[PDB]
Amino acid sequence: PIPSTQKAAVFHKFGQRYQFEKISVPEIGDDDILVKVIYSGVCHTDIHVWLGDFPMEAKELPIVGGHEGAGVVVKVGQNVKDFKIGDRAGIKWVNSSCTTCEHCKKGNEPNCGDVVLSGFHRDGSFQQYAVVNGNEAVKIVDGIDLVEVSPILCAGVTVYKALKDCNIQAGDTVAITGAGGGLGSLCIQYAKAMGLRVLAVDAGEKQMHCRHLGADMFINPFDSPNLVSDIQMMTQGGPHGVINLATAVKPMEDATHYVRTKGTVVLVALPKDAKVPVDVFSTVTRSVTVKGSYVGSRQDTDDALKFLQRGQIKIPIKVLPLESLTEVFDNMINHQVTGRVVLDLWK
Amino acid sequence: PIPSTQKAAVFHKFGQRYQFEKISVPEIGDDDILVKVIYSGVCHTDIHVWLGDFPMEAKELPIVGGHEGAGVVVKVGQNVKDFKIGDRAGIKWVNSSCTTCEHCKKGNEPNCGDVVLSGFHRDGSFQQYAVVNGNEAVKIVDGIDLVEVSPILCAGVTVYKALKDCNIQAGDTVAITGAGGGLGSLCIQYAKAMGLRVLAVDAGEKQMHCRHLGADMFINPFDSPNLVSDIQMMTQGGPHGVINLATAVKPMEDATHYVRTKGTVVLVALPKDAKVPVDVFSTVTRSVTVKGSYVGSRQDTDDALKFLQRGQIKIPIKVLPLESLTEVFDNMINHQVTGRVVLDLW
Amino acid sequence: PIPSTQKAAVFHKFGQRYQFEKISVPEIGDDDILVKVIYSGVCHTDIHVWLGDFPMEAKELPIVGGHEGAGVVVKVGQNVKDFKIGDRAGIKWVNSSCTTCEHCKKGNEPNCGDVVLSGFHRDGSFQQYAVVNGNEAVKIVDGIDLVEVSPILCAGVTVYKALKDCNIQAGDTVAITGAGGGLGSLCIQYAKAMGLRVLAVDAGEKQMHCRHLGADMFINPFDSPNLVSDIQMMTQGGPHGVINLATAVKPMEDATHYVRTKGTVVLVALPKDAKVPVDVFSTVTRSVTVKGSYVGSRQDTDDALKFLQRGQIKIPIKVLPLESLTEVFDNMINHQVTGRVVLDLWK
Amino acid sequence: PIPSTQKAAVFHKFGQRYQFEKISVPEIGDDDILVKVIYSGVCHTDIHVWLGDFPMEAKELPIVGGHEGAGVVVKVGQNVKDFKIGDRAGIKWVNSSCTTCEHCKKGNEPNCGDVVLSGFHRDGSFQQYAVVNGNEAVKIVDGIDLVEVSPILCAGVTVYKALKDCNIQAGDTVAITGAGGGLGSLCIQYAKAMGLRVLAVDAGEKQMHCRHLGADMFINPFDSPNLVSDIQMMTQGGPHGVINLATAVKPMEDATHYVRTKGTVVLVALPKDAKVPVDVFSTVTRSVTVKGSYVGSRQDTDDALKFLQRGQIKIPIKVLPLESLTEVFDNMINHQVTGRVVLDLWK
Ligand SMILES: [Zn+2]
Ligand SMILES: [Zn+2]
Ligand SMILES: [Zn+2]
Ligand SMILES: [Zn+2]
Ligand SMILES: [Zn+2]
Numbered sequence A, C, D: 001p002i003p004s005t006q007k008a009a010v011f012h013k014f015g016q017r018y019q020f021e022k023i024s025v026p027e028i029g030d031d032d033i034l035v036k037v038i039y040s041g042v043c044h045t046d047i048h049v050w051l052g053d054f055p056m057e058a059k060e061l062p063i064v065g066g067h068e069g070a071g072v073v074v075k076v077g078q079n080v081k082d083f084k085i086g087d088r089a090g091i092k093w094v095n096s097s098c099t100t101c102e103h104c105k106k107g108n109e110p111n112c113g114d115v116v117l118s119g120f121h122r123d124g125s126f127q128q129y130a131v132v133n134g135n136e137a138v139k140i141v142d143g144i145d146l147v148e149v150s151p152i153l154c155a156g157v158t159v160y161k162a163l164k165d166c167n168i169q170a171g172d173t174v175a176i177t178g179a180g181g182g183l184g185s186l187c188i189q190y191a192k193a194m195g196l197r198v199l200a201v202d203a204g205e206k207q208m209h210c211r212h213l214g215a216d217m218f219i220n221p222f223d224s225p226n227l228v229s230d231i232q233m234m235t236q237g238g239p240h241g242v243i244n245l246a247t248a249v250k251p252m253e254d255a256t257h258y259v260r261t262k263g264t265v266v267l268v269a270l271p272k273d274a275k276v277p278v279d280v281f282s283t284v285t286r287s288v289t290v291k292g293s294y295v296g297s298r299q300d301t302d303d304a305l306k307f308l309q310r311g312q313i314k315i316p317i318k319v320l321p322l323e324s325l326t327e328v329f330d331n332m333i334n335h336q337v338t339g340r341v342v343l344d345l346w347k
Numbered sequence B: 001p002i003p004s005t006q007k008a009a010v011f012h013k014f015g016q017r018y019q020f021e022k023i024s025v026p027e028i029g030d031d032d033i034l035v036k037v038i039y040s041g042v043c044h045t046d047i048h049v050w051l052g053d054f055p056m057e058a059k060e061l062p063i064v065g066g067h068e069g070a071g072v073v074v075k076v077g078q079n080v081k082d083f084k085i086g087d088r089a090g091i092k093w094v095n096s097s098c099t100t101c102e103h104c105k106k107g108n109e110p111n112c113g114d115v116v117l118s119g120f121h122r123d124g125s126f127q128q129y130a131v132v133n134g135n136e137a138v139k140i141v142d143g144i145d146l147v148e149v150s151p152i153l154c155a156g157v158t159v160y161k162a163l164k165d166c167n168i169q170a171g172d173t174v175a176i177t178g179a180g181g182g183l184g185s186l187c188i189q190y191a192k193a194m195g196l197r198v199l200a201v202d203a204g205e206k207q208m209h210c211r212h213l214g215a216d217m218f219i220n221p222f223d224s225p226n227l228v229s230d231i232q233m234m235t236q237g238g239p240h241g242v243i244n245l246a247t248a249v250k251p252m253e254d255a256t257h258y259v260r261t262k263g264t265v266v267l268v269a270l271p272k273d274a275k276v277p278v279d280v281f282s283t284v285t286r287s288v289t290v291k292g293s294y295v296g297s298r299q300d301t302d303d304a305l306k307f308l309q310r311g312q313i314k315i316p317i318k319v320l321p322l323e324s325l326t327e328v329f330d331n332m333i334n335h336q337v338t339g340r341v342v343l344d345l346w
């Protein structure tokens, strides 16, 4: 028996308290799916949704956050055909779409005007039971633990989509800015899974961490005077691709500076008040392409999922209770993002 | 027949001034080819040859300017296979290349470390007889007036390469900034050849010229305070691709502003002191691609040349001598608006 | 005598052709003053409040616009010190200010945090009786035409302060972009009143107009190919000052190009999504200063009205009713010239 | 004790290898003065003189470079009325001026048309004996170390002049971008010497150096995602002035972003391919002024030197031989300085 009440984390207003409180269990729409989310991931966007910094409008309306959730389908709608009860499903950033849009008929559904967003426009994965469109829902393979898939739902798909947006060939050099973070570690693992020579740029103790994951090179801004020259000496002309994972505005310009001739620099993050200038003369002469990578489509999601399923990508995670999620948000204000943290909805 | 003197313009060092004086005939390289230039075009990169301002080291030694030139092959070198004597050929920006470099083997020769640039590292098109690599040369079909071919070798090719860097499908809307200029008059026509709905942004009443080159709609900076708003209103969300021919920094920033989501913004020129900012947030959300377009490849060259051959492109041009071409040149140090300027040796 | 219902133009909605409508006469403020406005001016900023274009949010409440109003005080209001019934007064863009801010003690009141703006924050001059703070209200001299003082309330003070911000010496060259516009004609007359050599830049048949205003020579973007070179030729190295009235971005960048070494380029307009780049090399070597001029101080206001009273400044206007002012609103979004407009409240 | 031959570092061609040659000692003009240059500073401007990248032309191609030199006067010309042999003298970037130009009467000699520039048009301080105009030469006090005064001749005077162009009062906040560089350290010390509150923006926490120089707050691009917001928090609305030493483009637009209302943003360097855009709306509403500071005037130079004399400003330096100067030129064509290099023209 589907329950009638659940535990969720709800903030009524921007900046307001997250509440571990009892709320009604959602009942699914005709095209939706009801998922007992057992584990949910926390990316930093949830703090930006809470702050309201994005020009977009959060539902507020007592919103439950979350865009990365793994669970089991417990109820299906009337017009849902391909899903069966007991299947594993994922709540992604793209909750639903119009599906007959210019952007929706293309391969990129999240850029539709009538997009429904988990944790922004719709109640997200921080609750025990969540509703998601069956068409945009994730097919998670049985025989892998949902705890490990939860970070893949946003971080794995995004970093994989960025590497694919680089249009890089096997053997080329890819540079990962901010490679010591969780997103960066996943970028390193995915790039090695695509047969790419990996160069890693970040400040601090990450020199050991990247090699822990297999990264072929690491560079420290703390010790290295000019990143451009050092990178271009280690890559013999610049990296064929650059992934700007750090949101600091200076690594973006450095990436644009040290990228190889005909190289591709992709922005991945969604930061505020950050701009990347570049000399038109050098952009034309080197024919570099600055590409923006948004959230991936279902096909990219399925690829990224298969990478973890086959064992190419493994991200260590710290499991925390839904009650303790409040503390987690505090860490995000202080930039204490700890690897990848996943929440057990039961606790 | 060949002469032993050829009327060209050479500097001895940086900062010196030209002259029409006949100079010794350049020997042919073994893979090179000697072409008698019948007509030659003039772009501002030749204006940038002087003063040594471009960061890439230049032939401070004696150097002949000029890059775009159409003429007849009078002789070749030791090893050449596909060329026949008497054929019509064109010299472009890329004179020769490493031919086995990473960037040269990929298919993009202009990007080698050992690139030869006509009018920078070899004698250009401002001479009567010039030597250029046969593998990087133009192949002109007979029956086409050379006066009209000269602008295709540089401006037409650059416009075609820019339009193909947009990766636009038949039917999308393309916005061209600086469409009243020569680069602009050419891009509107090349875009119309692709089945592209053309939107043009230029200042003044160069509109009628645009509109009647086949463009759907025209936008005027004088009239509009916000080009972005009008452009996004006329295209229903922004153009799928934007080609930046104007070098003003504002059109660059506007191009990134009014471009459609999943759009393609292309830089074309070799502009000094130009910078294109873009907010990372909107580039990521719109999944925008800001790409830089350099010279076209041999295949792109032939596509543009065949567009000239088949009658889809029509270009106004103006014939003046090499002997009598420092007036228009200095006028252009002041960026004199000049119809395509071709150089008839005679 | 003073009615209880008045004719006015109010757009409760941002984007509505606002209807000539009867509204309640405003309740007199405690320290404020009630002014029967007999003539009111129309500036392009009035359109932007209607458009909702400005990042600064206008009053989401019923707003009757206007920042330039000339009238007679019909009720004095409490906490007023020197205002007397029968005095002539002017409603400015700055309706009131905190008067005890870091910037308010600095002598520049419009940059206070608690600033109230006529036609934006408080009900403006398009109504029969309007409320304004006594300290920022204009002292218009009795015996002087109200129709003609109305345009000075926004254009005269602003262009005069811009010329003050050019910090130009007697005999120096000033170049005025958009000199044929409403702002521009006043700029030419004020600059000639301060002993400056006027150069005028505008498109079309306006050359005789500007030269009749006292402009020494005229340059036309329509006929002249390169404005920078021609201006530098007319001035022997560039104008000592430039005033950018047109919001077109081309003249702003050209102004930074052709301004003389050690020159001063002053921005005046309030445009949308328009940026001014400048080559760091050339701005440093030429030591040019790009300075922005916002609303004038009370001292600047009285200086400009002094110019009008003594006859140095003459404004041309077509007196129109409040009716058919929606025609001119459409004309302003139409990107089109119609001439300076002053409205008689009676009609 | 004047021989007829000296040691100098000369390059006959742009890009030529500089040579430690013996060359004839220059013959002093009647209005010139001959200074045994004992110490000479090396800033990146000399490297741009060598490259010929600047739009101007080192027209002396047979050229000994150098714009900052400290030495003893060993000979004067016929028209040198007030200088004495044994006095200390400084070779500044501005070697001489016409003294009858508009810009020369205004007090700004470097913007003269007939200006001769040390290390560019006239032989500079890289030689043992150098010639400089007696009117434009710097008066260094006897009893001060020439090695330490030499960097003030270019860095100290320039940062002092920029801080002067800010026209800031005692107690206001000034923000220094690139505060960890040599220019940055000098401006921090000068700004403290004028009674300002210094805020410093640069890379690394090793910049406790800035806190030692007197900077009141410091912000790190590494740690802080958005510098603008944090700076405005630390200054309660933005710094009253900004001094842009870094030529990176993003810091220049960021400086324009976070500068307080009615503030002054000053550009200082002479970079290539650098440009500062700014939104006209915010420049007008905030009345921000983007001003460029070129080299200082003689009054500015003596004001700056008095400060070193009194001990408020100190420039740690690495002393290198005149022979080794080629190494210094080699590094700067590649990347920035590791410190203020000064040449003992004895070695
Ligand atoms: Zn996320
Ligand atoms: Zn859609
Ligand atoms: Zn060309
Ligand atoms: Zn090659
Ligand atoms: Zn220096």
Ligand SMILES: [Zn+2]
Pocket (backbone or CB within 6 Å): D097, D098, D099, D100, D101, D102, D103, D104, D111, D112, D113, D114
């Ligand atoms: Zn002078």
